[PDB]
């Protein structure tokens, strides 16, 4: 059960080492694991969940207007233990219900959903293959949880020659400490930490 | 950066493991991650964590060879093609050009394997997964530098590729003690097993 916390302000975000900028023709918006199951660990009516949903919703609308593909990731229910593998040792047998995307962020016509198996959105999915085929090499990452799946996805993007853009105010985590630590790690070793405000004109 | 001296934390300060895995010689591979002169040069060798780091990796390599546990070294190549190096330049500059050899204390002996390292993860653009699948080895003992960068990414890829990572807390070093401790905590909580040289000895 995640204790309530406020999404940090863009002024507290660490400074970027890299000077990348989102270009609509090169970008993909990834809404990472925004399933009811994962959001249920927080009190939905409490911070960081209302700001997280409002910021992702605004960014998603902007992506659709800019012709930026929207990709959702979702873990499947009743996973085969062989397929789930070493995750069981840390998290148990996994979700059986609430596999749907939170109603506030329900996918619209044209949006794509990929079945998620590991922390990284690139493991066992068509994401790299689709990014290569469409010449898209920039990944805008939003969702939960910053230090786990968001971090692993960004690390993979980076290693696969895809520029990761982690939206600091459109991610949530187990705590504010974990949230801040992830942004610091991204700016220092993986990619770009951006904000809804900085990102808005680049799209 | 020039890494300021720090002592490798003691096994009792290590965070508690969530998982209860144990190294089995028939299933394990020892990965000596980026123990190149170039990377060790950022520390003052004559000061901590380096003498303990080299002695502990040397002791562990010796046990592995006796246990027939394959020893795999990773090394970044010099004068890298910018296309192949890709986004790493944006963070660390162009590919290293000198001191690509493994530190003399840990020089590979006959039978050891060396893989050319391209990314933080030792699994990217290498035969590592393919060789482990083939030899039925699903446990990776990870030692070397730097804990929060290459050690961490290799461990994350291991876990995601169904390989049990065993990070030896007292056989790794980092940019600081803070980074070293944060990595071990992250491993125990989300990725795998944080072990020590003393705890691995009876398992080997």
Automatic annotation (TrEMBL), chain A:
Its EC number is 3.3.2.1. Binds 1 phosphopantetheine covalently. Pathway: Siderophore biosynthesis. One of its GO terms (molecular function) is lyase activity. It comes from the Bacteria. It catalyses: isochorismate + H2O = (2S,3S)-2,3-dihydroxy-2,3-dihydrobenzoate + pyruvate. Keywords: Hydrolase, Lyase, Phosphopantetheine, Phosphoprotein. Its cofactor is pantetheine 4'-phosphate. The keyword Hydrolase applies. This is isochorismatase. The gene is vabB.
């Amino acid at each position: 059960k995640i204790a309530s916390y406020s999404i940090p302000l863009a002024e507290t975000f660490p400074k970027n080492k890299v000077h990348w900028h989102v270009q609509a023709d090169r970008a993909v918006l990834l809404i990472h694991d925004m399933q009811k199951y994962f959001i249920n660990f927080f009190d939905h009516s409490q911070a960081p969940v209302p700001e997280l949903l409002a910021n992702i919703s605004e960014l998603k609308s902007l992506a659709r207007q800019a012709n930026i593909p929207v990709v959702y990731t979702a873990q499947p229910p009743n996973q085969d233990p062989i397929e789930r593998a070493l995750l069981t040792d840390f998290w148990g047998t996994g979700l059986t219900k609430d596999t749907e995307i939170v109603s506030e962020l329900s996918p619209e016509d044209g949006d794509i959903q990929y079945t998620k198996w590991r922390y990284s959105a690139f493991k066992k999915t068509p994401l790299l293959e689709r990014m290569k085929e469409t010449q898209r090499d920039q990944l805008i990452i939003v969702g939960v949880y910053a230090h786990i799946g968001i971090l692993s996805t960004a690390l993979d993007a980076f290693m696969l020659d895809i520029q990761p853009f982690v939206v600091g105010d459109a991610v949530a985590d187990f705590s504010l400490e974990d949230h801040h630590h992830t942004l610091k790690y991204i700016t220092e070793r993986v990619g770009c930490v951006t904000s809804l405000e900085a990102l808005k004109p680049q799209m």
